[PDB]
Amino acid sequence: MVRVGMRAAPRVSLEALKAALGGLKLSEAKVYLITDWQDKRDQARYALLLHTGKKDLLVPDAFGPAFPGGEEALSELVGLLLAQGARRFYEAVVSPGEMTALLDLPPEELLKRVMAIANPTDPGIYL
């Protein structure tokens, strides 16, 4: 799996995601938003694991209200994925102190862990 974007860099990460995605259709994809356990969602950060079924992509913890412009970038990101056909969204919650370690796991290990702990989520909460 490819890794694009950078931690705490929402705008650059969104641009990198758009570049890697292109016009790819995502109807059978599973979109995993990886977030930290904070008191309120208004403090949350998010990483993205996009499982298309034919290839995976990871973006580190670059989105969300935890970063300036991050909530806006997350909204634009989810809108883009919906526009390209993605309909299955999930959220995995991890401790703040283990987020970077999780994201640095070998691709197969990361995918297994995120898939195991993620719950279906309504993409509208990110819009």
Side-chain angles (χ1 to χ4, degrees), residues 41-78:
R41 229 189 236 296
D42 98 307
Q43 309 168 303
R45 64 175 62 207
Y46 303 80
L48 165 70
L49 173 64
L50 175 62
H51 175 71
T52 74
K54 297 175 186 167
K55 58 182 189 182
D56 306 317
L57 168 156
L58 175 68
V59 179
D61 51 319
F63 307 113
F67 313 115
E71 192 164 58
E72 170 175 37
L74 172 64
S75 188
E76 293 186 39
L77 168 60
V78 172

mmCIF file of all heavy atoms in Angstrom, residues 41-78:
data_model
loop_
_atom_site.group_PDB
_atom_site.id
_atom_site.type_symbol
_atom_site.label_atom_id
_atom_site.label_comp_id
_atom_site.label_asym_id
_atom_site.label_seq_id
_atom_site.Cartn_x
_atom_site.Cartn_y
_atom_site.Cartn_z
ATOM 1 N N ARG A 41 -15.205 15.353 19.849
ATOM 2 C CA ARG A 41 -14.819 15.196 18.453
ATOM 3 C C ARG A 41 -14.226 16.499 17.922
ATOM 4 O O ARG A 41 -13.539 16.510 16.905
ATOM 5 C CB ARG A 41 -16.032 14.783 17.607
ATOM 6 C CG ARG A 41 -15.778 13.581 16.700
ATOM 7 C CD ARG A 41 -16.930 13.347 15.731
ATOM 8 N NE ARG A 41 -17.472 11.996 15.828
ATOM 9 C CZ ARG A 41 -16.790 10.891 15.535
ATOM 10 N NH1 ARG A 41 -15.527 10.977 15.125
ATOM 11 N NH2 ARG A 41 -17.375 9.703 15.643
ATOM 12 N N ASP A 42 -14.474 17.601 18.617
ATOM 13 C CA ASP A 42 -13.946 18.879 18.162
ATOM 14 C C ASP A 42 -12.442 19.006 18.386
ATOM 15 O O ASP A 42 -11.838 20.000 18.007
ATOM 16 C CB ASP A 42 -14.701 20.030 18.847
ATOM 17 C CG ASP A 42 -13.964 20.597 20.043
ATOM 18 O OD1 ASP A 42 -13.584 19.825 20.954
ATOM 19 O OD2 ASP A 42 -13.774 21.832 20.075
ATOM 20 N N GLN A 43 -11.827 17.980 18.980
ATOM 21 C CA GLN A 43 -10.388 17.981 19.258
ATOM 22 C C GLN A 43 -9.683 16.868 18.477
ATOM 23 O O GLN A 43 -8.452 16.704 18.549
ATOM 24 C CB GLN A 43 -10.158 17.722 20.747
ATOM 25 C CG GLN A 43 -10.961 18.633 21.649
ATOM 26 C CD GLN A 43 -10.935 18.175 23.080
ATOM 27 O OE1 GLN A 43 -11.308 17.033 23.388
ATOM 28 N NE2 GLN A 43 -10.506 19.060 23.977
ATOM 29 N N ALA A 44 -10.487 16.106 17.750
ATOM 30 C CA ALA A 44 -10.025 14.957 17.011
ATOM 31 C C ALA A 44 -9.133 15.176 15.800
ATOM 32 O O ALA A 44 -9.222 16.186 15.089
ATOM 33 C CB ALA A 44 -11.222 14.126 16.570
ATOM 34 N N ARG A 45 -8.244 14.212 15.617
ATOM 35 C CA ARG A 45 -7.407 14.178 14.429
ATOM 36 C C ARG A 45 -7.750 12.891 13.714
ATOM 37 O O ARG A 45 -8.214 11.923 14.343
ATOM 38 C CB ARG A 45 -5.919 14.211 14.770
ATOM 39 C CG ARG A 45 -5.380 13.022 15.553
ATOM 40 C CD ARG A 45 -3.860 13.119 15.721
ATOM 41 N NE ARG A 45 -3.426 14.301 16.466
ATOM 42 C CZ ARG A 45 -2.240 14.905 16.325
ATOM 43 N NH1 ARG A 45 -1.343 14.462 15.454
ATOM 44 N NH2 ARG A 45 -1.940 15.960 17.083
ATOM 45 N N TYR A 46 -7.482 12.847 12.409
ATOM 46 C CA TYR A 46 -7.807 11.657 11.628
ATOM 47 C C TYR A 46 -6.792 11.306 10.567
ATOM 48 O O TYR A 46 -6.264 12.182 9.879
ATOM 49 C CB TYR A 46 -9.145 11.824 10.858
ATOM 50 C CG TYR A 46 -10.376 12.159 11.683
ATOM 51 C CD1 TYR A 46 -10.614 13.470 12.101
ATOM 52 C CD2 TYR A 46 -11.288 11.168 12.034
ATOM 53 C CE1 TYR A 46 -11.742 13.793 12.864
ATOM 54 C CE2 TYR A 46 -12.414 11.468 12.781
ATOM 55 C CZ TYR A 46 -12.631 12.786 13.196
ATOM 56 O OH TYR A 46 -13.739 13.081 13.955
ATOM 57 N N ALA A 47 -6.561 10.005 10.432
ATOM 58 C CA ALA A 47 -5.740 9.402 9.376
ATOM 59 C C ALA A 47 -6.772 8.682 8.487
ATOM 60 O O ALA A 47 -7.934 8.495 8.888
ATOM 61 C CB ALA A 47 -4.746 8.394 9.960
ATOM 62 N N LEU A 48 -6.354 8.280 7.302
ATOM 63 C CA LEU A 48 -7.231 7.625 6.342
ATOM 64 C C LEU A 48 -6.614 6.380 5.767
ATOM 65 O O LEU A 48 -5.488 6.432 5.258
ATOM 66 C CB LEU A 48 -7.560 8.556 5.149
ATOM 67 C CG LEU A 48 -8.164 7.896 3.891
ATOM 68 C CD1 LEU A 48 -9.593 7.422 4.198
ATOM 69 C CD2 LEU A 48 -8.150 8.867 2.670
ATOM 70 N N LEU A 49 -7.340 5.267 5.853
ATOM 71 C CA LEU A 49 -6.923 4.054 5.208
ATOM 72 C C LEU A 49 -8.017 3.774 4.187
ATOM 73 O O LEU A 49 -9.182 3.504 4.535
ATOM 74 C CB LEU A 49 -6.756 2.905 6.194
ATOM 75 C CG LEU A 49 -6.470 1.528 5.580
ATOM 76 C CD1 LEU A 49 -5.147 1.520 4.869
ATOM 77 C CD2 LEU A 49 -6.519 0.476 6.700
ATOM 78 N N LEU A 50 -7.682 3.875 2.905
ATOM 79 C CA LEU A 50 -8.654 3.645 1.835
ATOM 80 C C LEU A 50 -8.390 2.266 1.256
ATOM 81 O O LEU A 50 -7.325 2.036 0.685
ATOM 82 C CB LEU A 50 -8.507 4.743 0.770
ATOM 83 C CG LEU A 50 -9.345 4.639 -0.479
ATOM 84 C CD1 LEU A 50 -10.852 4.695 -0.050
ATOM 85 C CD2 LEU A 50 -8.956 5.809 -1.428
ATOM 86 N N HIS A 51 -9.344 1.353 1.435
ATOM 87 C CA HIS A 51 -9.239 -0.048 0.956
ATOM 88 C C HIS A 51 -10.153 -0.159 -0.261
ATOM 89 O O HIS A 51 -11.368 -0.271 -0.108
ATOM 90 C CB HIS A 51 -9.732 -0.968 2.100
ATOM 91 C CG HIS A 51 -9.799 -2.427 1.745
ATOM 92 N ND1 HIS A 51 -8.682 -3.216 1.564
ATOM 93 C CD2 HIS A 51 -10.865 -3.231 1.541
ATOM 94 C CE1 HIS A 51 -9.059 -4.445 1.266
ATOM 95 N NE2 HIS A 51 -10.376 -4.476 1.243
ATOM 96 N N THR A 52 -9.604 -0.129 -1.483
ATOM 97 C CA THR A 52 -10.484 -0.158 -2.652
ATOM 98 C C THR A 52 -10.973 -1.532 -3.064
ATOM 99 O O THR A 52 -12.004 -1.657 -3.736
ATOM 100 C CB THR A 52 -9.827 0.494 -3.898
ATOM 101 O OG1 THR A 52 -8.832 -0.380 -4.439
ATOM 102 C CG2 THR A 52 -9.191 1.819 -3.559
ATOM 103 N N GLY A 53 -10.222 -2.541 -2.649
ATOM 104 C CA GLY A 53 -10.524 -3.922 -2.974
ATOM 105 C C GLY A 53 -9.537 -4.386 -4.027
ATOM 106 O O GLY A 53 -9.422 -5.580 -4.310
ATOM 107 N N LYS A 54 -8.824 -3.436 -4.628
ATOM 108 C CA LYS A 54 -7.827 -3.767 -5.645
ATOM 109 C C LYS A 54 -6.506 -3.067 -5.359
ATOM 110 O O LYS A 54 -5.561 -3.191 -6.144
ATOM 111 C CB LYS A 54 -8.322 -3.373 -7.042
ATOM 112 C CG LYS A 54 -9.559 -4.132 -7.484
ATOM 113 C CD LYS A 54 -10.069 -3.613 -8.816
ATOM 114 C CE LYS A 54 -11.381 -4.271 -9.203
ATOM 115 N NZ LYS A 54 -12.008 -3.529 -10.339
ATOM 116 N N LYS A 55 -6.459 -2.320 -4.247
ATOM 117 C CA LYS A 55 -5.255 -1.590 -3.805
ATOM 118 C C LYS A 55 -5.626 -0.687 -2.633
ATOM 119 O O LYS A 55 -6.758 -0.204 -2.563
ATOM 120 C CB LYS A 55 -4.636 -0.755 -4.938
ATOM 121 C CG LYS A 55 -5.561 0.281 -5.576
ATOM 122 C CD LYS A 55 -4.869 1.007 -6.715
ATOM 123 C CE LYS A 55 -5.730 2.168 -7.185
ATOM 124 N NZ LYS A 55 -5.074 2.870 -8.346
ATOM 125 N N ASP A 56 -4.674 -0.481 -1.727
ATOM 126 C CA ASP A 56 -4.890 0.329 -0.520
ATOM 127 C C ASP A 56 -3.989 1.561 -0.497
ATOM 128 O O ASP A 56 -2.922 1.601 -1.146
ATOM 129 C CB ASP A 56 -4.602 -0.491 0.729
ATOM 130 C CG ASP A 56 -5.375 -1.779 0.759
ATOM 131 O OD1 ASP A 56 -6.582 -1.748 0.427
ATOM 132 O OD2 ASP A 56 -4.764 -2.820 1.106
ATOM 133 N N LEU A 57 -4.431 2.572 0.245
ATOM 134 C CA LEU A 57 -3.687 3.816 0.383
ATOM 135 C C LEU A 57 -3.840 4.326 1.802
ATOM 136 O O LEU A 57 -4.939 4.249 2.409
ATOM 137 C CB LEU A 57 -4.221 4.850 -0.628
ATOM 138 C CG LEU A 57 -3.816 6.321 -0.529
ATOM 139 C CD1 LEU A 57 -3.979 6.975 -1.922
ATOM 140 C CD2 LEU A 57 -4.710 7.044 0.493
ATOM 141 N N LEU A 58 -2.746 4.813 2.375
ATOM 142 C CA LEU A 58 -2.788 5.367 3.716
ATOM 143 C C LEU A 58 -2.378 6.839 3.684
ATOM 144 O O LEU A 58 -1.466 7.204 2.932
ATOM 145 C CB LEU A 58 -1.795 4.626 4.630
ATOM 146 C CG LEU A 58 -1.608 5.157 6.056
ATOM 147 C CD1 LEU A 58 -2.885 4.950 6.879
ATOM 148 C CD2 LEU A 58 -0.427 4.450 6.710
ATOM 149 N N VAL A 59 -3.082 7.670 4.459
ATOM 150 C CA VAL A 59 -2.698 9.072 4.660
ATOM 151 C C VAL A 59 -2.570 9.123 6.170
ATOM 152 O O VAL A 59 -3.435 8.612 6.889
ATOM 153 C CB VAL A 59 -3.790 10.088 4.258
ATOM 154 C CG1 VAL A 59 -3.264 11.520 4.540
ATOM 155 C CG2 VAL A 59 -4.179 9.935 2.793
ATOM 156 N N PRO A 60 -1.490 9.709 6.718
ATOM 157 C CA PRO A 60 -1.318 9.792 8.175
ATOM 158 C C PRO A 60 -2.334 10.717 8.843
ATOM 159 O O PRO A 60 -3.278 11.166 8.196
ATOM 160 C CB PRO A 60 0.123 10.268 8.347
ATOM 161 C CG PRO A 60 0.401 10.989 7.062
ATOM 162 C CD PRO A 60 -0.295 10.193 6.004
ATOM 163 N N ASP A 61 -2.119 10.984 10.129
ATOM 164 C CA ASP A 61 -3.043 11.832 10.880
ATOM 165 C C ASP A 61 -2.856 13.294 10.504
ATOM 166 O O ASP A 61 -2.104 14.049 11.136
ATOM 167 C CB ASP A 61 -2.881 11.581 12.392
ATOM 168 C CG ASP A 61 -1.435 11.660 12.868
ATOM 169 O OD1 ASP A 61 -0.514 11.153 12.169
ATOM 170 O OD2 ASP A 61 -1.228 12.207 13.968
ATOM 171 N N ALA A 62 -3.569 13.667 9.446
ATOM 172 C CA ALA A 62 -3.481 15.002 8.858
ATOM 173 C C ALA A 62 -4.790 15.756 8.825
ATOM 174 O O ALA A 62 -4.790 16.954 8.434
ATOM 175 C CB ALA A 62 -2.990 14.858 7.394
ATOM 176 N N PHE A 63 -5.897 15.123 9.218
ATOM 177 C CA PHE A 63 -7.174 15.786 9.085
ATOM 178 C C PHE A 63 -7.887 15.965 10.394
ATOM 179 O O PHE A 63 -7.478 15.397 11.407
ATOM 180 C CB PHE A 63 -8.070 14.974 8.138
ATOM 181 C CG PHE A 63 -7.431 14.675 6.819
ATOM 182 C CD1 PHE A 63 -7.097 13.370 6.481
ATOM 183 C CD2 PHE A 63 -7.167 15.695 5.912
ATOM 184 C CE1 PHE A 63 -6.489 13.063 5.236
ATOM 185 C CE2 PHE A 63 -6.566 15.418 4.671
ATOM 186 C CZ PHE A 63 -6.227 14.111 4.332
ATOM 187 N N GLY A 64 -8.917 16.813 10.385
ATOM 188 C CA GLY A 64 -9.690 16.995 11.604
ATOM 189 C C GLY A 64 -9.448 18.321 12.285
ATOM 190 O O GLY A 64 -8.458 19.002 12.014
ATOM 191 N N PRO A 65 -10.353 18.690 13.205
ATOM 192 C CA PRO A 65 -10.263 19.960 13.941
ATOM 193 C C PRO A 65 -9.033 20.121 14.801
ATOM 194 O O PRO A 65 -8.733 21.213 15.307
ATOM 195 C CB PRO A 65 -11.581 20.009 14.715
ATOM 196 C CG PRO A 65 -11.969 18.551 14.864
ATOM 197 C CD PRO A 65 -11.560 17.931 13.567
ATOM 198 N N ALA A 66 -8.283 19.046 14.965
ATOM 199 C CA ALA A 66 -7.038 19.130 15.714
ATOM 200 C C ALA A 66 -6.048 20.051 14.998
ATOM 201 O O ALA A 66 -5.133 20.572 15.618
ATOM 202 C CB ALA A 66 -6.424 17.750 15.846
ATOM 203 N N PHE A 67 -6.228 20.256 13.696
ATOM 204 C CA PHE A 67 -5.314 21.077 12.909
ATOM 205 C C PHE A 67 -6.027 22.231 12.211
ATOM 206 O O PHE A 67 -7.168 22.100 11.795
ATOM 207 C CB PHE A 67 -4.635 20.220 11.810
ATOM 208 C CG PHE A 67 -4.107 18.911 12.307
ATOM 209 C CD1 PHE A 67 -4.656 17.722 11.831
ATOM 210 C CD2 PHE A 67 -3.047 18.851 13.230
ATOM 211 C CE1 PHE A 67 -4.168 16.485 12.256
ATOM 212 C CE2 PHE A 67 -2.549 17.609 13.663
ATOM 213 C CZ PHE A 67 -3.105 16.424 13.178
ATOM 214 N N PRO A 68 -5.347 23.376 12.067
ATOM 215 C CA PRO A 68 -6.026 24.485 11.378
ATOM 216 C C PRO A 68 -6.306 24.039 9.939
ATOM 217 O O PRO A 68 -5.424 23.492 9.266
ATOM 218 C CB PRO A 68 -4.993 25.616 11.424
ATOM 219 C CG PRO A 68 -4.197 25.329 12.648
ATOM 220 C CD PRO A 68 -4.047 23.794 12.621
ATOM 221 N N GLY A 69 -7.533 24.256 9.491
ATOM 222 C CA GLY A 69 -7.900 23.866 8.140
ATOM 223 C C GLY A 69 -8.174 22.373 8.039
ATOM 224 O O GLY A 69 -8.568 21.901 6.973
ATOM 225 N N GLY A 70 -7.969 21.654 9.134
ATOM 226 C CA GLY A 70 -8.185 20.205 9.139
ATOM 227 C C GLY A 70 -9.630 19.758 9.052
ATOM 228 O O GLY A 70 -9.923 18.713 8.438
ATOM 229 N N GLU A 71 -10.548 20.473 9.700
ATOM 230 C CA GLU A 71 -11.958 20.118 9.644
ATOM 231 C C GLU A 71 -12.479 20.341 8.221
ATOM 232 O O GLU A 71 -13.233 19.537 7.682
ATOM 233 C CB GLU A 71 -12.768 20.956 10.660
ATOM 234 C CG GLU A 71 -14.198 20.426 10.855
ATOM 235 C CD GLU A 71 -14.904 20.960 12.089
ATOM 236 O OE1 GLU A 71 -15.043 22.188 12.209
ATOM 237 O OE2 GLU A 71 -15.331 20.139 12.934
ATOM 238 N N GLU A 72 -12.064 21.452 7.617
ATOM 239 C CA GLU A 72 -12.425 21.783 6.249
ATOM 240 C C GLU A 72 -11.879 20.705 5.291
ATOM 241 O O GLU A 72 -12.622 20.212 4.436
ATOM 242 C CB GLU A 72 -11.846 23.168 5.893
ATOM 243 C CG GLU A 72 -11.919 23.582 4.453
ATOM 244 C CD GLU A 72 -11.428 25.027 4.197
ATOM 245 O OE1 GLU A 72 -10.446 25.491 4.848
ATOM 246 O OE2 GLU A 72 -12.039 25.690 3.315
ATOM 247 N N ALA A 73 -10.615 20.308 5.467
ATOM 248 C CA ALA A 73 -9.991 19.301 4.594
ATOM 249 C C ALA A 73 -10.679 17.953 4.738
ATOM 250 O O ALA A 73 -10.871 17.234 3.744
ATOM 251 C CB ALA A 73 -8.468 19.155 4.914
ATOM 252 N N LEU A 74 -11.054 17.603 5.968
ATOM 253 C CA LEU A 74 -11.750 16.334 6.207
ATOM 254 C C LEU A 74 -13.106 16.345 5.484
ATOM 255 O O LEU A 74 -13.488 15.347 4.862
ATOM 256 C CB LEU A 74 -11.957 16.136 7.709
ATOM 257 C CG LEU A 74 -12.845 14.945 8.104
ATOM 258 C CD1 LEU A 74 -12.204 13.652 7.673
ATOM 259 C CD2 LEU A 74 -13.071 15.004 9.617
ATOM 260 N N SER A 75 -13.825 17.467 5.572
ATOM 261 C CA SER A 75 -15.126 17.604 4.918
ATOM 262 C C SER A 75 -14.979 17.458 3.412
ATOM 263 O O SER A 75 -15.743 16.723 2.792
ATOM 264 C CB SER A 75 -15.739 18.984 5.271
ATOM 265 O OG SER A 75 -17.067 19.043 4.806
ATOM 266 N N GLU A 76 -13.998 18.147 2.848
ATOM 267 C CA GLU A 76 -13.738 18.078 1.409
ATOM 268 C C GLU A 76 -13.338 16.658 1.020
ATOM 269 O O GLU A 76 -13.774 16.171 -0.013
ATOM 270 C CB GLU A 76 -12.622 19.024 1.012
ATOM 271 C CG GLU A 76 -13.011 20.481 1.175
ATOM 272 C CD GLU A 76 -11.976 21.446 0.650
ATOM 273 O OE1 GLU A 76 -11.368 21.168 -0.401
ATOM 274 O OE2 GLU A 76 -11.801 22.504 1.295
ATOM 275 N N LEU A 77 -12.540 16.008 1.861
ATOM 276 C CA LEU A 77 -12.115 14.638 1.580
ATOM 277 C C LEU A 77 -13.301 13.682 1.532
ATOM 278 O O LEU A 77 -13.433 12.885 0.580
ATOM 279 C CB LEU A 77 -11.110 14.166 2.660
ATOM 280 C CG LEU A 77 -10.802 12.659 2.655
ATOM 281 C CD1 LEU A 77 -10.209 12.249 1.311
ATOM 282 C CD2 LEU A 77 -9.794 12.378 3.763
ATOM 283 N N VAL A 78 -14.171 13.757 2.537
ATOM 284 C CA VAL A 78 -15.323 12.856 2.540
ATOM 285 C C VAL A 78 -16.258 13.173 1.370
ATOM 286 O O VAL A 78 -16.765 12.256 0.734
ATOM 287 C CB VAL A 78 -16.033 12.887 3.937
ATOM 288 C CG1 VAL A 78 -17.358 12.097 3.920
ATOM 289 C CG2 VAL A 78 -15.062 12.205 4.977
#
